[PDB]
Design a protein around this ligand. Structure first.
Ligand SMILES: O=C(NO)c1ccc(C(=O)NO)o1
Ligand SMILES: O=C(NO)c1ccc(C(=O)NO)o1
Ligand code: NA
Ligand code: NA
Ligand code: NI
Ligand code: NI
Ligand code: NI
Ligand code: NI
Ligand code: NI
Ligand code: NI
Ligand code: NI
Ligand code: NI
Ligand code: NI
Ligand code: NI
Lengths: 173, 173, 173, 173, 173, 173
């Protein structure tokens, strides 16, 4: 047992490891989308920029959780990172909807983690999730919903004009 | 009777109180529209910016009238602020038309106030309305008419592409 | 149902709407006090400055809650804003005590909202209230209590000298 | 009863007084260690710098809690500050281990305080502890554990060379 | 015996330890007064500022004496810090008089220490007391006497107006 | 077939996908090492800094290869990222040797890729490997060998003093 461990339950430790793996997987998925939009037959540079930035943000999430694990006295256990469900994301609207679904899944995982933290009477971990993850997920979900709504009202994915003008006027700024 | 009151008729005082309430109500309506366009299923950030700024301008109108009341020797009497007629404003063109109607109503109220001020031989209040309210209402009505015309000629509200491009190229600047 | 709604209970949504209305009402009350102290027979400019700033802060509270509602997937429903209980606030000490009472009421409302949020297992809303509202209310209540104590120990409201010197040396800075 | 007290239970008030006394005692202990390393037969200036800074930080903790007490409507009751358990701290590694033990004790006290705050349904005090004390204690415990590990792997306390080089390369920066 | 000890008598060493404890106790008393004036039913922020600064100055006195002890070859022995005689200091004038009494007591202790230092033929310690403590105590006593005189001539503690205006015009600068 | 594909053989495309996966795996391994040295029972912050930077460099390698794939007309196919062989890297010298082995493996993979590129008469891909990967691998291998040699000559891993002083004087700059 580590000399710094105090009030850190092992169920919380396992949940932290699983959430690390999940954030890494989300980073992988965003990387996949980003370079999907870099293909010459898709060619939407601002979509690719957006999803690359999101991938780096998810990697930051993962590293934050690893530092948290080492901080409380837990021990990091890394698992394989699964391949994303798709290799062809069809369109920008489809990738936006997939991202919204992914963020909702990660958000439910974080919410159940917060429940487990409040149950094991771990206020430090509870507030860590409250402060560094929950509102960021809320903002990401609201933003992805805004993007999906805008792309839908413009005639996507039938109108490629819509996706071009959206790549220019919304993501290119 | 207040020691500063001079040539201030009580009909003018009641009209000032009513106009205060009306400007507050207009601010409330603009707030409603602003946060209607912030919803994830509408998602037009520049429409929301525009109507939030208009709400703050109407609140400035109200406070200006309150200071005018205290200046002439009148006495402020606040009333309830009515809820806006709608909670769902359908579209950006519809909200623009509603705003145009609201500003025309407020303008007629201010014009009848100026008539009552010239009747009671109150040149100070007459010029106060002339200087701080009339031309601002004229400019607001002309601008809302311009916006309605542009949105109409672009295919709104059927074309959501039109409202997106208008939010970007007209209100986002 | 909105595409972004997740773990947002409808009781929480109704509580958010009610708290929006309450913050708007508090803003209205502070506006009333502010322009009460602008009257020529009261004439305490720094009291008026103080209460006008407090009114703007309460309006900021309201808009923050509206953005929170749109963020979680709720739907804003605006109600009438009630007229303040009084039109003549008697004295600066009396207005300070009324403000203290109002802030205590708003604080109890926010506390019951936090209880409802922790009950419905909504940690995001719980931490939102924790972070953006609770400590601000605590600070406001402590400050209003300090002001009431100082005004009392100076001989208010009998001594108008006390209220003048307090307007100058405490609120005018 | 103070005019600002709201939802502040008296058990919480007593816990706040006890935690004030505990933070003051920790400051006293760190002061003792700091000036132990200033003796000519110990003579480790950076160890002394480190523990003096830690003493000042603990005094800041205490004053923060006193301001919190006055804020919620509680009443400060000061007790004697106990003399530290030791006057001779043997070595730098021994003082580091003593500091780690002390911080773990203070952390358990703060955790039980947070439990009592969530029990009495005091979300403001709960978030105050969450925000201003918990993560700081976690960081302090992790840092003291790092220092103890490094000193151990270097041959302390047998190797005085180890403590000298640690004072130079780790604490002197 | 320490390798640096020269002409340092053990009676002087015990006196230095006792004076360390006394300066720490004075710091504790000033802290008590400072946060007494922060209560909502007292609410004199500049009195609190003044006494907090005085507490920090007394802590500086204590640390200076500890460094002096380690310098001459003595050995620090810390004792408990006694709780201040009071928890409620009644008024600003009463706290000023208590501070004057406390500083006179500390001054007599320092004077007897200087006598013991000149007796044991310790000119270094004699000049240390002469240079770093005596005139500072004289200045503090004169300043506290000035404050007590001013508060008395203004009608304190009956006139709370007096204490308010004194907090503003004398301590708030 | 993509409209930009010219002289790009499909064996080269498969090799590019495999090398992408390998660079991602190397990034994962370096991340594992980095946060291994962040544990409280290891506690070598500069080792962790070094391996975190190396992980980010390997991720840059991977993204460079993905952009190259999209450039030539190939199609990215992502695979699972395998878990590193170890979770406990024993010591800094052991982690350095593991990193040297990993970089030698990646270098052999890149060399066989260059052979396949010169065989399929693809000078662009050959020079891409020549310019952006080969010399970087040579430098990394030489640097890791230097680090291993230095750690060995200092008495690692038996002497923890050696690893501490190496973390300070070589990696902390
Ligand atoms: O919020 C709680 N702990 O922090 C909690 C969950 C369930 C109960 C309970 O058992 N009520 O009867 O309490
Ligand atoms: O000032 C003195 N020493 O520095 C001193 C004190 C008493 C005497 C004495 O014994 N006079 O007869 O001298
Ligand atoms: Na005119
Ligand atoms: Na919190
Ligand atoms: Ni994430
Ligand atoms: Ni609970
Ligand atoms: Ni354009
Ligand atoms: Ni208007
Ligand atoms: Ni509020
Ligand atoms: Ni004055
Ligand atoms: Ni502390
Ligand atoms: Ni060195
Ligand atoms: Ni002193
Ligand atoms: Ni590489």
């Amino acid at each position: 047992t580590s000399q710094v461990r105090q009030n850190y339950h092992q169920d919380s430790e396992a949940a932290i490891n699983r959430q690390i793996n999940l954030e890494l997987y989300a980073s992988y998925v965003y990387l996949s989308m980003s370079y999907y939009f870099d293909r010459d037959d898709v060619a939407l540079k601002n979509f690719a920029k957006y999803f690359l930035h999101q991938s780096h943000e998810e990697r930051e999430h993962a590293e934050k959780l690893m530092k948290l694990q080492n901080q409380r006295g837990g021990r990091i256990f890394l698992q394989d990172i699964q391949k994303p469900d798709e290799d062809d994301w069809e369109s920008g609207l489809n990738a936006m909807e997939a991202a919204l679904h992914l963020e909702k899944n990660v958000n439910q995982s974080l919410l159940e983690l917060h429940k487990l933290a409040h149950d094991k009477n771990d206020p430090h971990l509870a507030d860590f999730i409250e402060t560094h993850y929950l509102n960021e997920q809320v903002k990401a979900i609201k933003e992805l919903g805004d993007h999906v709504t805008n792309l839908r009202k413009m005639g996507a994915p039938e109108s490629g004009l819509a996706e071009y003008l959206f790549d220019k006027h919304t993501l290119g700024d």
